[PDB]
């Protein structure tokens, strides 16, 4: 069997925040942020909405885009690093809000920024082994609530959003090949140490990051893994119509595109509008590219990214 | 391809707590707890150890039982409702602690009490689609740190522990058939509402449970899902050598066994010693049954359980 993209959808919270707006609350500059990351705007969730709310709306739009009823879904996977609750799963909460009562399996995957690729690959495994026919794969994050807004270095980097994909069984390949990786030795470079223990937060509840280090290894790792997935599938970088990378830093994206010998004209870019949305970033960009007319059916797409762990991956697929 | 248990392992923290111990802490009785659940003992993690520690130890024992080096693992999945951190995944932390630097994929799954079956089914999907050859599937929990020990109704129910399995590609089936289910409408019956947001805990940091409701639906749901997996696989209840259920409540297990028309002599039972260890419960019983001389190869095992979500499932396999 094969897994193909039936539809895509995305949701960004109403409050769109520019660098200048944020410049009021924190000691930063629009020019400084842009030079570092290429980020100009963020979206921050409203007080009353959480990851499940963002995720549900994106899924709703993904379901409409695929012309599918909620009851047709037989698998739900949510990739998030900011679940609604300690437990149960955010996926079950999303399931409930989508009005899905067909009893389909639902669970969260935790791979941080690389979560959607981890969730997408997982759904692909279910479909190929015949365990599911129509899976709902969602990357949804509310990182604004685990950011230290008194830390100018990290708080300007992250945003909120959700991206959803309807992945379905097919005779011909959508997802051609994928490659996931992880190395726990890089924990210290990006993490939120805190946990809920004994009625309180134990450890730091905020994101700790090592920018230079993350930058150093991301460029190194992403170029290698990209080359692997391509040559392993039997392709070359020239047969790739689009790169849909994780949108944390444009400098990193520029570097990777150059290594594959691809023009930035073959790279979907949303980092300037969204910032680092973690697991929601890739499906956000994918939906943005599809909705903007850039991504066309039959085209070969290279999904790619690295996240906290470190965990990283790349997914080659034909839209 | 097919996925088979190559080796098994388990770990329970040193601090063993009897019902009488809790009777000092809370207005309860040993007989009352035993009458409700059949639980006599629990294990509580030490101050310095967390889910990754319990998980790592269980995995080492599982690795030894399979005669495998850590470097042979090309997939790690941890099922937990009590991760070390907000992020990254506990699986990467476990990966690091096992000294695995081969870059294998690692991520957490959240299905609460049904976590191990979700992870096992997930690992199974990876193996059948040829995406992995030797997977490390771990259920590890430190629920003691999300229990309100001033609540007699819930605190006597849960314990800490970790159970691991090495699942590997094979010519003949280990995992014959599985069926996972979820319904977010039963959220209010079992949950830990709290989350880390804006530098503090937002919502209740402790487990909230509806005993009668969970009991009511578990018996009804588990009998149904059990019957389904059997009939779908083409087996009968009589062809089952062992039931390896989730060990939350002995009354529920008894009820389920009587429904399948099976004797308690064909049911591995550890609830009295372990209590409800969530995702660790099933692999704990499985490892115990194999090591105690009860479970023999070629025998048919029925893994089963329900957890917060609700999420539930049953897994039919031949050891």
Curated annotation (Swiss-Prot), chains A, B:
**Any single GO BP term:** fatty acid biosynthetic process
Pfam assignment, any one: ACP_syn_III
Annotated segments matching region ACP-binding: 247-251
The catalysed reaction is: malonyl-[ACP] + acetyl-CoA + H(+) = 3-oxobutanoyl-[ACP] + CO2 + CoA
- Which GO molecular-function terms appear in the entry? 3-oxoacyl-[acyl-carrier-protein] synthase activity; beta-ketoacyl-acyl-carrier-protein synthase III activity
Pathway involvement of the protein, from the record: Lipid metabolism; fatty acid biosynthesis
Provide the transmembrane region boundaries: none
Q: How does it assemble?
A: Homodimer.
Family listed = Belongs to the thiolase-like superfamily. FabH family.
* Swiss-Prot/TrEMBL domain comment: The last Arg residue of the ACP-binding site is essential for the weak association between ACP/AcpP and FabH.
Spell out the protein name for this chain.
Beta-ketoacyl-[acyl-carrier-protein] synthase III
Species whose genome carries this gene = Neisseria meningitidis serogroup C / serotype 2a (strain ATCC 700532 / DSM 15464 / FAM18)
């Amino acid at each position: 069997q094969y897994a193909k993209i039936s539809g895509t959808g995305s949701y960004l919270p109403a409050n769109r925040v520019s660098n200048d707006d944020l410049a009021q609350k924190v000691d930063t500059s629009d020019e400084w942020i842009t030079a570092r990351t290429g980020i100009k705007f963020r979206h921050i969730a409203a007080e009353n909405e959480k990851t499940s709310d963002l995720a549900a709306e994106a899924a709703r739009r993904a379901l409409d885009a695929a012309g599918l009823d909620s009851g047709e879904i037989d698998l739900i996977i949510v990739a998030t690093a900011t679940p609604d609750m300690q437990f149960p799963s955010t996926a079950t909460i999303v399931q409930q809000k989508l009005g899905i009562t067909n009893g389909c399996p639902a669970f969260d995957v935790q791979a941080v920024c690389a979560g959607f690729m981890y969730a997408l690959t997982t759904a692909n495994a279910y479909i190929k082994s015949g365990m599911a026919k129509n899976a709902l794969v969602i990357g949804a994050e509310t990182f604004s609530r685990i950011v230290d807004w008194n830390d100018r270095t990290t708080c300007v980097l992250f945003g909120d959003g959700a991206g959803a994909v309807v992945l379905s069984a097919a005779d011909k390949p959508g997802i051609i090949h994928s490659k996931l990786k992880a190395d726990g030795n890089y924990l210290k470079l990006l993490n939120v140490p805190g946990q809920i223990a004994c009625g309180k937060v134990s450890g730091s509840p905020y994101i700790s990051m090592d920018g230079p280090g993350v930058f150093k290894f991301a460029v190194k790792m992403l170029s290698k893994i990209a080359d692997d997935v391509i040559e392993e599938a039997g392709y070359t970088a020239a047969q790739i119509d689009w790169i849909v990378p994780h949108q944390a830093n444009r400098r990193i994206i520029e570097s990777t595109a150059k290594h594959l010998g691809l023009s930035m004209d073959k790279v979907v870019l949303t980092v300037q509008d969204h910032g680092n949305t973690s697991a929601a970033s890739i499906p956000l960009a994918l939906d943005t590219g599809i909705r903007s007319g850039q991504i066309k059916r039959g085209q070969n797409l290279l999904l790619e990214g690295i996240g906290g762990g470190f965990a990283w991956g790349a997914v080659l697929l034909q839209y």
